[PDB]
Each structure stands twice: as structure tokens, then as C-alpha cells.
Amino acid sequence: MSDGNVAWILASTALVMLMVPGVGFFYAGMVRRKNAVNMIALSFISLIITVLLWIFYGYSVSFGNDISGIIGGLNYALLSGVKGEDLLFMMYQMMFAAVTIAILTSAIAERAKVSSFILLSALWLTFVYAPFAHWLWGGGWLAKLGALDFAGGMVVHISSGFAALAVAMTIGKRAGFEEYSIEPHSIPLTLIGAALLWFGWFGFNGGSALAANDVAINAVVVTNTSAAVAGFVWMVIGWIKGKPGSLGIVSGAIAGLAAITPAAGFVDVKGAIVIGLVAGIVCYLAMDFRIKKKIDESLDAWAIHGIGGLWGSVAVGILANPEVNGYAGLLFGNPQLLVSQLIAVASTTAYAFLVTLILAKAVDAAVGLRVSSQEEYVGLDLSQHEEVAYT
Amino acid sequence: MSDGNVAWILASTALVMLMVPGVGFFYAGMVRRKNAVNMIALSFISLIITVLLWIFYGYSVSFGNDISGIIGGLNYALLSGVKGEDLLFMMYQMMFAAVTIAILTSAIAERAKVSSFILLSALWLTFVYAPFAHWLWGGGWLAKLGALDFAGGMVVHISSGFAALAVAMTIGKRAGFEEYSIEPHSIPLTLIGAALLWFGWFGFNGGSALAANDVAINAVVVTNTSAAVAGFVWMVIGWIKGKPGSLGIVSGAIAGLAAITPAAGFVDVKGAIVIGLVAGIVCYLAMDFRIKKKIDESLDAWAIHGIGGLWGSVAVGILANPEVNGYAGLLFGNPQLLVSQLIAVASTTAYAFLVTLILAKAVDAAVGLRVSSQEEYVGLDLSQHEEVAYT
Amino acid sequence: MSDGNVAWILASTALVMLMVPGVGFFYAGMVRRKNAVNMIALSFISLIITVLLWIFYGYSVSFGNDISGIIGGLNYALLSGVKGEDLLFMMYQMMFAAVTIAILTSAIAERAKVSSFILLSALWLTFVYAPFAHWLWGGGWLAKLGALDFAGGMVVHISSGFAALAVAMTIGKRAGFEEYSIEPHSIPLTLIGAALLWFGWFGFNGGSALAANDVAINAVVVTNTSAAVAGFVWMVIGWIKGKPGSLGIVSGAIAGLAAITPAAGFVDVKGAIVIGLVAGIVCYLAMDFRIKKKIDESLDAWAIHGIGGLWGSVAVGILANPEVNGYAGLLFGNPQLLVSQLIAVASTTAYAFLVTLILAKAVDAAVGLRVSSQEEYVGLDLSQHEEVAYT
Ligand SMILES: [Xe]
Ligand SMILES: [Xe]
Ligand SMILES: [Xe]
Ligand SMILES: [Xe]
Ligand SMILES: [Xe]
Ligand SMILES: [Xe]
Ligand SMILES: [Xe]
Ligand SMILES: [Xe]
Ligand SMILES: [Xe]
Ligand SMILES: [Xe]
Ligand SMILES: [Xe]
Ligand SMILES: [Xe]
Ligand SMILES: [Xe]
Ligand SMILES: [Xe]
Ligand SMILES: [Xe]
Ligand SMILES: [Xe]
Ligand SMILES: [Xe]
Ligand SMILES: [Xe]
Ligand SMILES: [Xe]
Ligand SMILES: [Xe]
Ligand SMILES: [Xe]
Ligand SMILES: [Xe]
Ligand SMILES: [Xe]
Ligand SMILES: [Xe]
Ligand SMILES: [Xe]
Ligand SMILES: [Xe]
Ligand SMILES: [Xe]
Ligand SMILES: [Xe]
Ligand SMILES: [Xe]
Ligand SMILES: [Xe]
Ligand SMILES: [Xe]
Ligand SMILES: [Xe]
Ligand SMILES: [Xe]
Ligand SMILES: [Xe]
Ligand SMILES: [Xe]
Ligand SMILES: [Xe]
Ligand SMILES: [Xe]
């Protein structure tokens, strides 16, 4: 119970929900005007399909009775037997799933069939997210190995980042991706999405303590810290490479946010500083590398969330401070934690990429992921929604 | 008291406030570029005029000493004698009134005099809202008959929906409403308003428990449920009728949100599913019907809130689950609740429509509701605000 | 401790953070399309540089051990020795600093070097904000004289308002400021920023009680009151002077918000009414005066926050109601409070203006504040960020 604790998590749940459309705007501003509605619409659909699957069985498969430590049962299907605290928990977690699917839409920007997205999205929820959530937070085998993930560096960031990479590769580059660079139609729209993501992350990392306590407070402090540091890094890089674009600055902060998520509740401020410092560097390099290889993993869910989540989940095993939340990492005389994290990160990264790959091809073969080239031409707002963003 | 309870309601109050401009954006994106500022401006004015009337006497007339069970006294004028908890309550409720007036602006889109709006708006607050709030939440006669309305299916949705229909009919169609269909100038702007409405509804329905407790938690769960279901319905309908526009999807979710509001704290998840399922269907049919009849109830406050609120208030008498919050409906061996709801819905729907009708004509006759046709031509941003939305 | 209290402040911190980009949007909509990204980007950078300086030493210099009652020590550098409650406090306050720097960007709209801004901004934080925060909230000499500032009428509004005036004068008018009046490129964008500022102020004033208690509740009530009153005033003025623009309406509300901030937790509703009534009048006159004198203090941080904060800080000494929060002003038989406020307002206004003036010239001489005239021509989005707002 604890009224303050329910108050805070009630709030945190509202805050994470906001992050879903928040992703839609963040992404929409980066795509062409002819796909603006589609990019946002996608985040909204993600929310809708997630709520339904989560209640239906998604929540159960994640936190229901464990089987072979890799998945939960159906004892909670249609929330059968979920009450009081569990209901709030079920809800808070529901929102984590939704955001994950939204981040994912990075890989299909400007060229996917909504129906295929819904289909692939529902399957990914079932065979990738639910499993991960269970492995780490539902008493799964990874939790058993002693792995940790405070707010979802793996469950959310690694999964979407790598799943997005696989999907990007499966669906193929956007027409002209190579010959010409696509221009953002509304940076301000993206910045509005960015502001909503920073604001909502308070509930994300800070709500992960499941109580208005000291852990949450620490999570909030380090979360803002890692974010500022990584934002500063991309600002210096941008300057060093020419001019400090705003897109670079917010993408830098987001990298810092993703990296700190798995560790928000275990590390101290100084650790938050290195986590963010490194995240800015690696994610940026990751972005350049993915770009160099000509992969159209469009809005860098991979380079930023995939990579940012990976480093952070690992950094947890290095910097976990017993002083902060009991746990300790290598730096604090505990080699084991690092091993558990390495194992965890290894498994989750490989699974997310390979299984997503399978799923994409499966759906692609079964129904086809991409829209016709002419639809891609006139834009998905018109072709997939029969709508027009602006007039 | 209870710090957690005050914390949560403090938050819920901020969340409902956000919904007012949230309505302005939601609507603004649906009107032409020449009326964008006006559509938003209206929601802002609604907030301002409401705060002032509420404190002045609005709050008192709603929750002050009852007279003949149909209205409250002036014992709270200028909040005379309102302290501690009451102050917080007074505030939370103030925000409910504001949102109501904002939804209402649906019926006057692109052709009303701000001054007339303020006037009509202030009168509606006095003779429609305050009464309704008192009847149901201020110990009025409807409460006596045993009627219920958890978060405002009647007090807020039915009232605005039907009052909007009356006003729409009084003010007349927009020039060209018939010959040509008006196009939204910025769907993304509307989606931003939509995201703000979903997010704020957490405080709306979830804050209606007046405590960070299990009822609130249930309200939050079912609220998201009804919303997802109804959003899914309009998505299928849209697909079935062609393409799934984003406007249809969010209007579907909103229908689900309005329908669940009166019941958020009394029904279970399965009930939330039927409430949303049905809401999507009826509101959509209502929209088509209002359209068929050529009524320019512009942004479907009526079809969506009016109808969505009506069904939901009734559904309360059918699905109220004793298990959930003590109360039971027909389905749970209690025919009475249904009768109280039917009576309640009957009275509130008829009053809102007829009294609003009177008020509109009165103001129209006294000062005139509509702008000149040339002002309608150049747009109200320019003619009513001497401003220009975009450059 | 108190879970509800931590819950509420956790929320309030997220809410104040939102206000930073909220300022960016509010301002961005008022500048030309070619500077939109820059105006927003600035608010984001403010956040980033503040978080870093605050932790680094900013927080310590403000609330660390006092020396000669005018500044704090370094006992908290890198948050050395800051834990539990202090951490939350440190965070909440961090956000106050960030917002302050953002408001400030009013004076440099459309013509400053980001690098110079960062530099000047970091120096201002150190020698103006930290001092003020310490003087009033860190047990500084002003607190000793018995001065009060509930949510920052002086620490935040007076400081930014006057510092903005000085900077405006130092950097010089925008090319063409005189011959032609600059037009807002997106009023709706500004209104989105305005809605975010009203919403976040709940955490600002309401969170300043540092507990989900009666003071917070009162702060929230009066905050909404002063805001509505001042918004109404500018609405009447606008009408009286022609048409009620939306920009005028929100600027009016903001004036009311700034004026009530220093008093949010000490006055009653009736006092909130006069504070807002007067604020609307003075700030408007201040705006006209600053305009008359041809000063390009661009987005009226001065006329609105500077002046609004000044009046409010003074009004505190006149209306403080013992009934409300123990303290009493002149009107309540206590001449002393007024004197402490007058002294406080006198010192803070003079310091902010003169020291900022020094700092501006210093940086200007050291590196130069303004961009080349050609950069000003093509716009800072392109020249300072190598980006383009819309396509
Ligand atoms: Xe994102
Ligand atoms: Xe999903
Ligand atoms: Xe699922
Ligand atoms: Xe929980
Ligand atoms: Xe897809
Ligand atoms: Xe996907
Ligand atoms: Xe961000
Ligand atoms: Xe931000
Ligand atoms: Xe928001
Ligand atoms: Xe995210
Ligand atoms: Xe955060
Ligand atoms: Xe890659
Ligand atoms: Xe609405
Ligand atoms: Xe009103
Ligand atoms: Xe009223
Ligand atoms: Xe309350
Ligand atoms: Xe009107
Ligand atoms: Xe109205
Ligand atoms: Xe919505
Ligand atoms: Xe949404
Ligand atoms: Xe609404
Ligand atoms: Xe909700
Ligand atoms: Xe109708
Ligand atoms: Xe809260
Ligand atoms: Xe919140
Ligand atoms: Xe501002
Ligand atoms: Xe700063
Ligand atoms: Xe600082
Ligand atoms: Xe605090
Ligand atoms: Xe500057
Ligand atoms: Xe500055
Ligand atoms: Xe927003
Ligand atoms: Xe505002
Ligand atoms: Xe607002
Ligand atoms: Xe502000
Ligand atoms: Xe507020
Ligand atoms: Xe001035």
C-alpha cells in the first residue's frame, strides 16, 4: 500500500504513457511531411494494440507462473486473478511494453503497412518482449543468474534497438535512402517529442523503484545526470564536426537516458557521469557505423537505444554501488555482477536480433512488410491513412 | 489528509488542467489555418473565465448548501469558508468545469464571437453545469435517487455533448459546410492535443477516487482499457470503410474514454471491454447520423462526448460490480441502479439540450452568436484576435 | 520522509523540468521561422548546462555552508555529502535554475552565439543565481533580514527579468527591430509552450511547500487565481485597445503567475486577486514602456517576469496573511515584512541588472555576444545549428 507510493506510481504510470505518443512526435518530425501522420499514428496504434494484448495475455506471459525459467503462464490471462497492487503493477508495466513497440517504429519509417506492423508488433510482443520481461523481472532464468536491469536497459532499450536493426535490414532501405539524404519536415515537432520523453522518463526510471523512496530519488538524479552529460557530448562532437544541431543534442541526451535506465537505481552520481560520457561516445560511433554500412535503421533506435541500452546494462556490473542500493560491481570488489550482466546482455542482444529477424521474414513472407513503391512515393499518410498532415 | 492522497490529487488537478488547452489543440488541428489561434484561444479563455466564476460563486452554487435538491447556496461565494481539503476539492472540480466548457467549443468552431462565447459560456456554467454538478455530486436530488457518475459521464460528457448539439443548431452551419468538406490544417497538432487528453485522463478518472487507493487504480486500468477497445473499433471501422485515419483512431479512443468516465470506479476489466466496444460502435453511428442530418455540430462533441457519456452512464447501471466498488448493476442482481441511471441520464440529457437551446437563442437575440460572413471568410484569427497563426 | 511528500515533490520536480523546454516553445513561436530551432535549442542547452553546473558546484554554492551571508561553500561540490532528502531538494532546485536561464533567452532572441550564451549563462548562474538562491533560500543575509520568497519571485523572476533587460541592452537591437515589427512564425507553437508553463507551475509554486500539505494546496489555488485574473486583465486591455490576441492573453496569465510565485504560499484568495489584477496592469504598462523606449528586450522577460516578480515580491509584504501561513504583511498589522521585502527587492533588482550588465560586456569584450549580420540574416537555425526548422 502506502498512499504516497501509490500516488507516485499512479503518476509514473501516466508519465510513461505519455512517452508513447512522445515517441511518435519525436520520430514524426524527422520524417517527410507526407509521412508525418503515419509516424505519429504508429505510436498511437502501438499503445492501443499493447493495452489489449497486455491485458488479454501479455501481462500473464510476462509475470505469470514461470516455466523453465523462460516464460510465464496464463494464470493472469484477461487479468484473471490480478488485484490491488498487482493491478497497478500490471498497468505501469503495460506502459513499458507500449513505449518499446513505439521506439521500434524507427526501423520502418516511411515504408511499412500498418497491418503488417500490427501483426509483426503483436508477435514481437509475444515472443521477444514478454520473454525478456519475464527473464529479468518475472523471476526468469536471467534473474536467477543474478542479472539486474533497473528500468529496462535490456528489456526495453536493447530489445527495441536490435529488433529495430533486424527489421530495418529485413524491410530494406527507403527509396533514395542512398542517392539523397531525407530531410526532417519539422524539427520543432521532434523537439516537442523530445521534451515529452525527458519529462516522462521521470516516471520511467524514477517509477521503477516502485515507491516514492530514496532509490527513486537517486534514479531521478542519475537519470538527469547521464542525460545532461551525453547531451553535452553530442553537443561537443557536433561543434567539433561543424555545428551543434539540436537533433544531435537531444539524440545525445536520449542515449544518456537509455544507458542510465538499467542502472538508474544502483549507481552514484559519479558513475552516472561516466555512464553518460561513454554512452554519448559509443552511440555516436554506432550511429556513424550504421550509417557507414548504409543500413536504413532510420531513426537510430539501434545506435541509440540498442547500443545505449547495451553499454548501460554492462556498466551496471561495473559501477553498481552497494552504498547506493546494496549491489556492487567490479569497481566495488564484485566481479560476479559484471558476469551476470555480460551473460544477460549477450543473451538478450542475440535473441532480440535473431528472433526478430525470423519474425520479420516470416511476416514478410506471409503478408509482406513494405508498401508498394508508389505508395512510398505519395507518402503513407495518404496511402495508409487516406489523410494529409498539413494544409 | 494523507500525504499520498493529497500528492495524488495535487497531481490529478494539474493533469485535468492540462486537458483544457489539450482540447484547444485537439480541436485546432481540425479547423482551417485561418481559425487555428481562435480554436486554441477559446480553450484558454474557457480556463480563465471558469477559474474566476468558480471561485466567485461557481464552486458554491455547485457544492454549497442544497436547496430543493437542485442547486447549492452561496455559503462558499469567493470561497468564503472553504479550507484545507475543501480547497483542494474545490480546485480539482474547478478543472472539470473548465474542460467541459472547452469540449463545448466544438459546436462553435470557426464562426462565433469570443464575447458571445464568454457570455453564453458563463451562463451555461451557471444554469447547466453548476446544477448538474450539484444534482450528482453536491448531494442533489439525482444523488438522492441513488444515481452515480464516477468521473463525469453526465456532469461533463453528456452536458457538453448535448449542449454542443443545441448550440450547433442555434448558431447555424459554417459557410460552405454543405458544398465542401472542411479540411484539417494540422493533424499533427490535433494528435498532440489527443496525446495530452489521454495523459490527463489519468488524473480525470483516476483522480476521481479522491485518494491514491484501489478505486483509483481500478479507474486507471479500466480507463485505459475502454480507450484502447474503442480506438481499436474505429480502427477496424475505418479499415472496413477504406483506410484507418489517425483522426478516426483517436476519436475512437476518446469515445471510449468518455463512456468509461462515469463508470471508471465501479466496473471490472471485462465490463470496461464491453463499455468500450459498444461506445466505439454507437458514437461512430452517432457521428454518421449527425453528419447524415447535415448538422454542423462541428467536432463531434455531441456524437462522441454526448453519446459516449450517455451510454457509459447507463452502462454503469448494468455492469457496476460490487466486487469492484461495492455497487452492483442489473447484471449483478440489481435492477434499481439501472433505473437510477436511466432517470439520471434522461433528466441530464433533456435539460442540457433544452436549457442550452434557450440560452443560445437568448444570447443570440440579446447580442448575436455568429460573426459576420466576411469575418468568417477571412478567419477568426484575424477578425476576432487580429492575429495570424503561421507565417 | 513521508511517502506522499516525496511522491508530490518527485512529481513537482518532473513538472518544473518540463517548464524549461516549455519556455523554448513559448519563445520559439514568437520568433521567425529561421530561428525557431535556435530558440528551442537554447532552452534545451540551458537545461543541460544547468544540470552539469548544479551538480558540479552550483548546488553547493547555493545551499552549502554560508560565508558572510552572501554565498555558500563547496562542501557539496559534485554533491559530495548530499543524500536522501537533500538529493531530492537538490534536484527540485536544479530545475528552478534551468527555467531561470531559459526565461533569460528572451533578451538574445534571434542574434546570439550559442557558445557565448553558454559562457554568459554559466557565469550568470555562478555570480547571480547561486548568490540569490543562497541569500533567500540558503540562509543568506536576505533571509536573515526576514525576507521571504515562496516560489521565486526574486530568485527566478526578478533575476531573469532584469538580467534580460541588461543583456538586451548590451547585445543591441535586432536588425530592423525599428523599421519593421517581427512577426511570430507559429502562434500555436507558442500556445503549446504556454500550456506547458501553466501546467508545470503546479509543481513550481505548489511544490515549493516541499510537502503535499495545506500550504501547497493554497499555493495551487492562489496560483491559478492570480493567473486567471491577470489573463483576464490583458484580455480586457486587448479588447479595449482593439482585439484580444491570444498572445496578450497568455502573456497576461504568465504575468499573474510570476507575481504570485513569491507569495503563492502566504496570501489568501482575495490577496491573489489583487496581486493578479495589479500584475496585469503594471506588466502591461512595463511592456509598453520598454517598447516606447525602443529596447529590444525581445520577448518581455523583463516587462513580465522582471516586473511581475518585483510587484509580487513586494505584494508579499503587504498581503501576507497569518491566517494562511503564519506570516503577516502591512495590511495585517505588520510593517516589518514590507520593509524586508522592499530591501530584498531593492538589492536583488539592482544586483541582477548591474552585475548582469558587467558580465555581458565582459563576455562581449572577451568573445563577442552577437552573430554576424549575415548570420542574423540567414537565421541562426542555419548559421548556428546548420539546421532548418521546417521543410
Ligand atoms: Xe525515441
Ligand atoms: Xe503490440
Ligand atoms: Xe503480449
Ligand atoms: Xe506497484
Ligand atoms: Xe512492418
Ligand atoms: Xe515492428
Ligand atoms: Xe531528450
Ligand atoms: Xe528537453
Ligand atoms: Xe505534457
Ligand atoms: Xe523512449
Ligand atoms: Xe529524468
Ligand atoms: Xe550495424
Ligand atoms: Xe475533445
Ligand atoms: Xe466559463
Ligand atoms: Xe458558475
Ligand atoms: Xe480532495
Ligand atoms: Xe457563441
Ligand atoms: Xe458555448
Ligand atoms: Xe486520445
Ligand atoms: Xe495517445
Ligand atoms: Xe476531454
Ligand atoms: Xe487514462
Ligand atoms: Xe443529431
Ligand atoms: Xe504524485
Ligand atoms: Xe504529473
Ligand atoms: Xe516564459
Ligand atoms: Xe547554465
Ligand atoms: Xe552554478
Ligand atoms: Xe525535499
Ligand atoms: Xe549571449
Ligand atoms: Xe544569457
Ligand atoms: Xe506538447
Ligand atoms: Xe500561460
Ligand atoms: Xe493554458
Ligand atoms: Xe516560466
Ligand atoms: Xe498552477
Ligand atoms: Xe525599460
mmCIF file of C-alpha atoms in Angstrom, chain A residues 2 4-5 7-8 184-188 191-192 194-195 198-199 202 212 214 217 220-221 224-225 228-229 232 235 239 243-247 249-250 269-270 273, chain C residues 3-4 6-7 10-11 13-15 17-18 21 25 37 40 44 47-48 51-52 55 78 84 87-88 91 95 114-115 118 383-391:
data_model
loop_
_atom_site.group_PDB
_atom_site.id
_atom_site.type_symbol
_atom_site.label_atom_id
_atom_site.label_comp_id
_atom_site.label_asym_id
_atom_site.label_seq_id
_atom_site.Cartn_x
_atom_site.Cartn_y
_atom_site.Cartn_z
ATOM 1 C CA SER A 2 1.359 3.380 1.183
ATOM 2 C CA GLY A 4 2.463 8.139 -1.217
ATOM 3 C CA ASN A 5 3.759 5.064 -3.012
ATOM 4 C CA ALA A 7 0.391 8.286 -5.645
ATOM 5 C CA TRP A 8 3.861 8.274 -7.116
ATOM 6 C CA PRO A 184 13.232 16.365 -41.292
ATOM 7 C CA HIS A 185 9.975 18.159 -42.032
ATOM 8 C CA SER A 186 9.544 19.678 -38.580
ATOM 9 C CA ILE A 187 12.414 19.772 -36.147
ATOM 10 C CA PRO A 188 10.212 21.672 -33.671
ATOM 11 C CA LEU A 191 11.784 18.730 -30.094
ATOM 12 C CA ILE A 192 8.271 18.628 -28.646
ATOM 13 C CA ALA A 194 11.994 15.095 -27.136
ATOM 14 C CA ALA A 195 10.738 17.296 -24.279
ATOM 15 C CA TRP A 198 12.729 13.644 -20.948
ATOM 16 C CA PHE A 199 9.747 14.646 -18.796
ATOM 17 C CA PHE A 202 10.980 10.718 -14.527
ATOM 18 C CA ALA A 212 8.484 7.231 -3.555
ATOM 19 C CA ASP A 214 15.448 7.048 -1.805
ATOM 20 C CA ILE A 217 15.200 9.839 -5.783
ATOM 21 C CA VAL A 220 15.860 10.619 -10.815
ATOM 22 C CA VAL A 221 19.154 12.315 -10.003
ATOM 23 C CA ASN A 224 19.081 13.644 -15.319
ATOM 24 C CA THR A 225 22.848 13.437 -14.920
ATOM 25 C CA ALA A 228 22.924 16.019 -19.491
ATOM 26 C CA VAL A 229 26.384 14.507 -19.866
ATOM 27 C CA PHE A 232 26.818 17.679 -23.786
ATOM 28 C CA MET A 235 26.998 18.932 -28.466
ATOM 29 C CA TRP A 239 30.623 21.522 -32.677
ATOM 30 C CA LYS A 243 27.716 22.997 -35.889
ATOM 31 C CA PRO A 244 25.772 21.760 -32.850
ATOM 32 C CA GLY A 245 22.436 20.755 -34.326
ATOM 33 C CA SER A 246 19.517 20.407 -31.933
ATOM 34 C CA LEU A 247 18.787 16.936 -33.287
ATOM 35 C CA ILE A 249 21.845 17.382 -28.815
ATOM 36 C CA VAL A 250 18.588 15.576 -27.968
ATOM 37 C CA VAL A 269 26.355 10.421 -9.405
ATOM 38 C CA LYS A 270 29.981 9.936 -10.443
ATOM 39 C CA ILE A 273 28.747 10.758 -15.207
ATOM 40 C CA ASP C 3 5.884 8.875 1.012
ATOM 41 C CA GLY C 4 3.189 11.296 -0.042
ATOM 42 C CA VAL C 6 8.296 12.517 -1.705
ATOM 43 C CA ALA C 7 5.675 11.470 -4.251
ATOM 44 C CA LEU C 10 9.052 13.836 -7.246
ATOM 45 C CA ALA C 11 6.156 14.913 -9.410
ATOM 46 C CA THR C 13 10.389 18.150 -9.986
ATOM 47 C CA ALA C 14 9.268 16.495 -13.232
ATOM 48 C CA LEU C 15 6.793 19.335 -13.691
ATOM 49 C CA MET C 17 11.731 20.334 -15.707
ATOM 50 C CA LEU C 18 9.005 20.369 -18.315
ATOM 51 C CA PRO C 21 11.577 23.250 -22.979
ATOM 52 C CA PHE C 25 8.364 26.575 -27.374
ATOM 53 C CA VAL C 37 15.171 25.698 -33.799
ATOM 54 C CA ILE C 40 14.007 25.998 -28.643
ATOM 55 C CA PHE C 44 17.389 22.642 -24.091
ATOM 56 C CA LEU C 47 18.767 22.516 -19.129
ATOM 57 C CA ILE C 48 21.921 20.590 -19.980
ATOM 58 C CA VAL C 51 22.312 20.155 -14.587
ATOM 59 C CA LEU C 52 26.064 19.900 -15.034
ATOM 60 C CA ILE C 55 25.863 19.102 -9.510
ATOM 61 C CA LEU C 78 29.872 17.129 -7.030
ATOM 62 C CA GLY C 84 18.297 11.278 0.922
ATOM 63 C CA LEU C 87 19.199 14.864 -3.075
ATOM 64 C CA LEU C 88 15.539 15.410 -3.877
ATOM 65 C CA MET C 91 17.096 18.176 -7.840
ATOM 66 C CA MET C 95 15.126 22.698 -12.192
ATOM 67 C CA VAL C 114 25.294 29.686 -28.677
ATOM 68 C CA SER C 115 28.847 29.453 -27.355
ATOM 69 C CA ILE C 118 26.666 29.028 -22.759
ATOM 70 C CA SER C 383 24.119 29.567 -39.127
ATOM 71 C CA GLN C 384 24.326 28.363 -35.518
ATOM 72 C CA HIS C 385 22.904 24.857 -35.873
ATOM 73 C CA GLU C 386 23.242 24.126 -39.566
ATOM 74 C CA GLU C 387 19.593 23.062 -39.408
ATOM 75 C CA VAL C 388 16.261 24.015 -40.942
ATOM 76 C CA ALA C 389 13.134 24.137 -38.797
ATOM 77 C CA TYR C 390 10.569 23.201 -41.406
ATOM 78 C CA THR C 391 10.550 21.751 -44.888
#
